[PDB]
Write a protein that binds this DNA or RNA. Sequence first.
RNA 1: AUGCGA
Lengths: 286, 57, 69, 57, 196, 443, 106, 65, 134, 283, 44
Amino acid sequence: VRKLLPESWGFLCPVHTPDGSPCGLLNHFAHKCRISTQQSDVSRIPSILYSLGVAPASHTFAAGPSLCCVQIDGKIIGWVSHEQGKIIADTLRYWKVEGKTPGLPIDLEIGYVPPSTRGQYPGLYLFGGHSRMLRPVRYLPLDKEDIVGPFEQVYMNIAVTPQEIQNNVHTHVEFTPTNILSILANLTPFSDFNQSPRNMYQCQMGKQTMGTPGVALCHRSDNKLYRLQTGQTPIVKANLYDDYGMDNFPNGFNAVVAVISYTGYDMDDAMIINKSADERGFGYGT
Amino acid sequence: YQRLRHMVNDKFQVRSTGPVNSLTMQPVKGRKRHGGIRVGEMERDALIGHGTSFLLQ
Amino acid sequence: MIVPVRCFSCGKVVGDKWESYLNLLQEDELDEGTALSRLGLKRYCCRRMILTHVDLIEKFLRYNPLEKR
Amino acid sequence: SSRHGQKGVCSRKWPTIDMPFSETGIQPDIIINPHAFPSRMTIGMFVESLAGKAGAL
Amino acid sequence: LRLTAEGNKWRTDILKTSVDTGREAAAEVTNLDKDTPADDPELLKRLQEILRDNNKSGILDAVTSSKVNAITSQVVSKCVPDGTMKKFPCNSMQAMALSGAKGSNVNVSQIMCLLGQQALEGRRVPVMVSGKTLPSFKPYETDAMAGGYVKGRFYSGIKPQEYYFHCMAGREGLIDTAVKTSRSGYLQRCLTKQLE
Amino acid sequence: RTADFRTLERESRFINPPKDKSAFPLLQEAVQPHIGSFNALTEGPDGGLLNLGVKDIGEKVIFDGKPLNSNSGYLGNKLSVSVEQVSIAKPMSNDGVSSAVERKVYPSESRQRLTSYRGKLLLKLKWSVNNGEENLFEVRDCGGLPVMLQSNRCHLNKMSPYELVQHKEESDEIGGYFIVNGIEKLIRMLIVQRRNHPMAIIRPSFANRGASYSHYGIQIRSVRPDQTSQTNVLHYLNDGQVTFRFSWRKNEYLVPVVMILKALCHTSDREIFDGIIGNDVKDSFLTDRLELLLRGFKKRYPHLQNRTQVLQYLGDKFRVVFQASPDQSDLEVGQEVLDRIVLVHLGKDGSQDKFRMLLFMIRKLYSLVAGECSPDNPDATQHQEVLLGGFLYGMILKEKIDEYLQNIIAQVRMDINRGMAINFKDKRYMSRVLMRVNENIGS
Amino acid sequence: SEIEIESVQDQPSVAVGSFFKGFRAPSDTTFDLYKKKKSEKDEFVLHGENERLEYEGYTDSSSQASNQYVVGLFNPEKKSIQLYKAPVLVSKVVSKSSKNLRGPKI
Amino acid sequence: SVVGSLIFCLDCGDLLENPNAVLGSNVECSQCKAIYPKSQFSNLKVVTTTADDAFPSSLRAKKSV
Amino acid sequence: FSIPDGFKKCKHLKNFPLNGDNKKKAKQQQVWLIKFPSNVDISKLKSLPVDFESSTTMTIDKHDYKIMDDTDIESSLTQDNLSNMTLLVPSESKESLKIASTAKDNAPLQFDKVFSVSETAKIPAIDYSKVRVP
Amino acid sequence: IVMTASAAIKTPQMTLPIWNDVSDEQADTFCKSISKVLLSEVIDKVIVTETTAARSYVIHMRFFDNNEYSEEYDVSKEELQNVISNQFIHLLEAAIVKEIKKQKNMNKVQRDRQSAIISHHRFITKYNFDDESGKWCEFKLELAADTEKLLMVNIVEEICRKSIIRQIPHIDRCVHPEPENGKRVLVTEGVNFQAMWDQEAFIDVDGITSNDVAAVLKTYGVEAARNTIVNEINNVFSRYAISVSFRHLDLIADMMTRQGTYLAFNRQGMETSTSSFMKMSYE
Amino acid sequence: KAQKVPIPGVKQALEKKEGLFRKHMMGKRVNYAARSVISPDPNI
RNA sequence: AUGCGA
Ligand SMILES: [Zn+2]
Ligand SMILES: [Zn+2]
């Protein structure tokens, strides 16, 4: 269960995971993920499906992996050819990014499962209900935003950047590859240059970090608070540092560092601070 | 650089005398309780390894 | 919390250069580099002290319980 | 800890005179040993150093 | 940490050769003719045959691994201190690995050369039932990278598709690391009781 | 110029916080998936999710053993009690007693007092007597429900940043969490089976159920409109027999699937066969398994000749446990079971559509058995959805109100079993029972 | 090469019914037609009886309201279709055995 | 109707009791009244086959590519 | 019965000219079935490209559509009467529907051609040269 | 090993030294010649035509080529005759009886075979065999209407994987891995010394080794199990290229052998120790 | 041996898992003991 | 117990 699966791409952060017993159990959502809290336009979807060539389930009177099943929220509404399966999936996604199909909310998740030898059981399982995990990707045919869920994502060719878009393949592209990272992983500068598990220990530090808890501290009464008074804004930051406003609650400070073994007390895990610097108030906390 | 709240520096503890549980009369638990660290089974065995039987007693 | 008195690394008094610097970014519409150059923070220890500052006290000060609101 | 999950305790508060001083006339706030990087591959920290220095200058 | 222009020249030139390696191994393990098009329909059906077989897919991983790992070995052996921007009696990274203060030649090559082929539980990257190791990869992508072979290095960064794999290896490392110590306590106490 | 400092902009925002809109809309938008979850218990279709929940709890019927001297065993007068609406009010505090005017209660208050941040939970009770002989309305106060901060039920739901400062809060306070006894607690989001969709799974528990069990099985987690769930599993026995599994009162139950088929709609064996294989007339594998299934049921229950008899058999066989005897016939208990168990995500009267979907589940199950389709992975994010804490809040509310009515019925049962002192009509009895159970479910 | 349409007949006459694979019915069984005029649309219900069972059929309203069926009769030699609107009715037939029940309880 | 080894009642669609086991001329439905063992006698046969799975082997493996 | 008052009895039916141009096994006449979304008004048609057999592209108010044609299930070239797509034939406004046939064989017949109107969509291709900028 | 001393290893192996004179090709021939061969393992296709008054199962088993399975598994069609007519049919017929309880060309010599097998087996009626290669085996099975229904494909499959052309009890496979750092050997996936004892003309029996401690103790006695434990564990560390003094491992083995057996270190092995408190302080 | 998380008896006493014998006999808390974060030093 | 240094 702890195995990191590729399905989570765009949904859960591959690095926001605690280290230890909880590892793999406590996932963290991507910073660009949304959660369905409602359901819509299920009422018009049968009408348009009927227009697209779906045979009414009372009338089809046939069933099998040899045929595509159109279902909505576990309401099987009809049957088509697998070819019409693909025609419907693509033309439907077109009317989703369009604004012309009011019975068709942008956020409907269109599960196409093509026919596959011993593959996933075929079908076109649409979903619009609650608690769906949904994330934006850029739909190229309309050069406009499209919401994709984890079910349909498996079978969708999403180029990671526009220059890597392969011809006749990627139907969407990532808006930004940061869209696959969680908040903390985007908050770590150049986190894409370190060994992953050191990035995860970075998440554990920022998560376990003594910082600025608030400014209403004169109106809270915690059993404990740690408030660093000498707070600064990193010189080096992600632009999401501003976009998520972590500058409101700075948790550290920009320090003059020498990368040097010299004193002989600087080994393995021990680092030296300037004494006069602390005397000037360096890292003073309460 | 960020200062972690875990000033495990603050976690220092020393006990040369303290309370004991009445059901054992053995050192109680916890730094804030002036409790006494446990010499567990592995530390007992390990001290037998050293031959330090007068230290183990 | 509040503009540090001195640059931790160097030792140069810096607390005098805050309001003018903020004024110089306002009043002089200058850029941070040139503003600090006119302020004399010619060391990155003194550069960083003010450049990185977050005078969060303005956010603290609105919680003052000693005046009606 | 730095922004790189390379956490370490402060072993001692070195007197400022005893620190090394650059020809720029400064002595660092924090000194981190280089041999920590080769296992950790914290090279994001190297770039963070060179970018934060550039960005201050 | 820098290489010469030369060392990056050999590195880039050798790293140009993995493109054939990916499918060449895919058609060898599939046991199909040389240069078989990466889009042969029979290739796709056979590759689905491998997808549905855990054992065949494991062999495909292992063989692709041997070949691309031979490419890694090549890269490092060529570029080594033979391409570093500054050498030994100066290059501190070389000093630490070669002295064995910390690191291995593996770490130094992972910074300066490439991460190389990631593995999990003993084999290459998991594949979705769609035949894809990432949304961005078409089903059955024969690229080694799509199998998880990362050509990027810490000095020049890793592509995002590549960060998802080094993240896989890093997690599986942290899991094994967190359970392995719990599997040794009972081994200790169970027989330490007897020989005391 | 890539991540430039917002320095004048920031310091302006510190000095003069927004009076109209928080900055960092990602910051408020990130915990948005929680808040929306809590608001859907108070606003939405009809009145929000919670009113659908009380629409699902239905009725709780009790008969005074109406003596009457059929009028002496056909109803000691029906009394069906239910709940029409459930209302939640924003935290208010009355001073001393109640004869005072209430004040809106603010979170700053709950934290400084180090106490819960409670709202009075009210629900419009419907007291239906003799199927309609007497209707009684009651707005009942159900104690203090911990309200989510910044919810459609927290005063800070609609406060501008400036106002937020005026209420001693972090100018950007996201909320979404609960102040209970001063301790900020949130409900952990959970990963659950993607709702309403058949997941083909091979599980060794499935063989562990007993003899003749295979590994193969289908699991669909039907979720009701109100988001309460009911998991249904299909198991293929080694004998070709297929059994339908469900869980009631957290006990598991197995029934032959052909029984639930003849139970949904009256149909011929040729109609079920036609339902499954269709044009696929060539699966001797499927033809034969289906002859074993249908012929085997025809062997076991030769006397179940029609759907109605089946309904009487199911209601009759669980009537002891569905608490609908002293009033309903085995046909009614059976039908309420069908509506309450089988693909409840499809809802009442979806029984032919529920039938078709069930046929789809049989077809997929045999596609797994033969091996013509891959198995799915419950643990792939592909096959998973997220139970939001607030939704759990709504499920647990529904359960708490169902139990609360259960307590009413228990109170009537004891009174009728120890006194029969008072008629279902007495207002004294309504107030008295209400005054004899404790009902602050808020606590 | 496309077949042209000569004439269209638009009013109710013929109907179509989906049934079990094997339907044959008595040599004479009769089919009672019904009509519903709802605002600006007719929903149809068919009802028949036989010697043991009775067959009743109705329209799938959610597909009926969202899809409409057309029938035509073509002659190759006349190139002409007589069009007929027909409701498709998924009908089930209950028997007298399907009309027996126990007491409402034990 | 008879299908494969199933024979459904022609009147009701019930898979009526197998002609091979009737104690009579034909058969009759328990839902319908159609006569079984007297009408169509059927000649029930099925070409059942192996699933091409029970028998993995090196020889199958050389036969599988 | 004539139930759900929302229903009416029938009063107007039509004779079926099964044999006015029929000849026993000699006229190759046919009956076709086409499925039409309710959104289209069939009565406002004039001809039907059902004759394309496969090339059933179709133009409904100058709008282009494609007509999916099926050749099984109800018309399967495989089993004797492989279809339940029952035909119910009337006769007169004073008579109940009848089972289609072509002689007195207890024979339920089938539709010679089954058609289905499928909604076409532009689904225009992505302009790769503009999007895949480096 | 150490903790449970399980007498049923997960990967029981027996190492076989092959004589210097034993050719590599002869050795691979022997490797094929000893491995077990299941009846399923030779089956290509199974077609069951159940036709029903007697319930008829006409089972046509279209096999592989005689020479194909004869060159992969060194077995004949005649061996298939004996196994089918004796093993396969008898076991399937027993499984059919079990299913009832669950319910409740054609030459004279061939005709004599069919009649004889019918005479040995109650269910079978006809027997047609591909005597020209062995490519198939057709036999007619007749059952009473009262037989109702079975999944004959599934029954056949189950009997197919339970019939063996060649089986060494407990021994599965002999492989020819490449020799390295030692004498040429074959590693078997099973443990049966007595069976290799007959193979002496290819294997220097004095040099047989195994990963099964219990099998060694039962066969070669306490000193061999002792050396097997210390060698096997030493191999366990050698895999991780760890140095461990041999004195430790050999001591540990002696403690596992303190009674002359394979006395594990859990509570069960502790029981026989004399300190009751030492037992008290474990479990 | 009775008939819910009942109060433990003497058997679910010093035995079972950690208990007394394991958690207070074979290993104990002790006086004259300290715990602290360790720091390097080459001059000692 | 949970979380935690790890
Ligand atoms: Zn300075
Ligand atoms: Zn019948």
